[PDB]
């Protein structure tokens, strides 16, 4: 029992019904479920938060809250400062995405347990390449190289804190949680996940959404 | 009137229908509409030649024809001994891209006639990275620099006819026809496109397809 979960929750996206159920709360029920997470912290506006609450007493998980912050790398922190104490393990999630697997879930936690910082992955359809100012193109980036990242991203606490520490001390704005881990030079592991695990910002991802769940 | 296009067009998904008209025959009457363009080779099977011989008097290019090889690059040589002796451009393109506008093709073919190579192409919306063969992050590949290419393909005949005797002299497979070019170290163009200009596979990319169109 020895997961915490930071939950980002910001009519917004991720409080629109999918089958009759808030986006959110896909997520957060997967969660739930799983033994090794010990709690769920919500950053969500204070509006919301009863979407959450409905359910504490038959959810086997504790329920937090922090506020939101201007930029998403400030909803992190602010989430991250009312974790456990003794969890060896932050799993920071967009609610936009519900989809992800229990089974894709598991394997990022492991993957992070093991390396100290981890992120579910996938291998990105789309031909990319590097483009340089001038417009130009600078090399056609390997196909077996490249990979879109998604939410869970995992890591160990304490390397996120000294990470804030860097970033609050030096002056950086940070495209994501496990990029700090970056500056700190310790590795971050690509777990490999599913097509499935969408983020759910348009009505065409909706839609999407739905016919996966059938 | 110098530009000859190579149109790709393989029920197969480049013939189902949106709005009761064939996925390739978008791309092929925006093309035709064009006054720089002067000719498309449509590679395809010949069971599906009469999808677009039946416009070819309605239309103000000439129509021809060439067979489909094994692979994509295959194909496009094929196209490409089909095309006019005395062609500026080539412009190649996926019919399953119906999506692209008249505006965005202007674009490219003027930039392809500039650089010699140019191809469409948006900056990528996923947080891509690179990853080693220990699944371990390399480094977060920058925000600006990243594009998804798309269609079409630009590119001066004897720039594409030298490339190609050089991928079958020295024994080569190609994931695209302007990465030939960069073999050659020719410089390639990247023409900013538009996100509507979808490639359609699924059934979720055709009803995207539909919502645009409207």
Request: aromatic letters at 8%; one cysteine or more; glycine letters at 4%.
């Amino acid at each position: 029992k020895s997961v915490s979960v930071i939950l980002l929750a910001g009519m917004p996206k991720q409080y629109i019904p999918l089958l009759g159920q808030p986006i959110a709360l896909y997520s957060f029920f997967t969660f739930s479920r799983m033994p090794e997470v010990k709690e769920i912290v919500v950053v969500c506006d204070p509006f919301f938060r009863d979407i959450f609450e409905e359910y504490e007493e038959s959810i086997d998980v504790d329920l937090s809250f922090a506020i939101p912050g201007k930029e998403r790398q400030d909803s992190v922190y602010s989430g991250l400062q009312e974790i456990d104490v003794n969890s060896e393990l932050v799993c920071i999630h967009d609610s936009a995405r519900p989809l992800v697997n229990t089974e894709d879930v598991e394997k990022v936690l492991k993957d992070g347990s093991a390396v100290g910082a981890a992120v579910l992955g996938v291998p990105a359809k789309a031909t990319i390449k590097e483009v340089n100012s001038d417009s130009l193109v600078v090399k056609t980036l390997d196909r077996k190289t490249l990979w879109e990242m998604q939410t869970p991203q995992v890591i160990k606490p304490e390397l996120l804190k000294k990470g804030f520490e860097l970033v609050k001390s030096e002056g950086l704005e940070v495209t994501d949680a496990v990029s700090i881990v970056e500056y700190l030079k310790h590795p971050v592991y690509v777990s490999q996940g599913s097509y499935t695990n969408i983020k759910v910002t348009t009505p065409d991802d909706l839609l999407l959404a739905e016919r996966i769940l059938s």
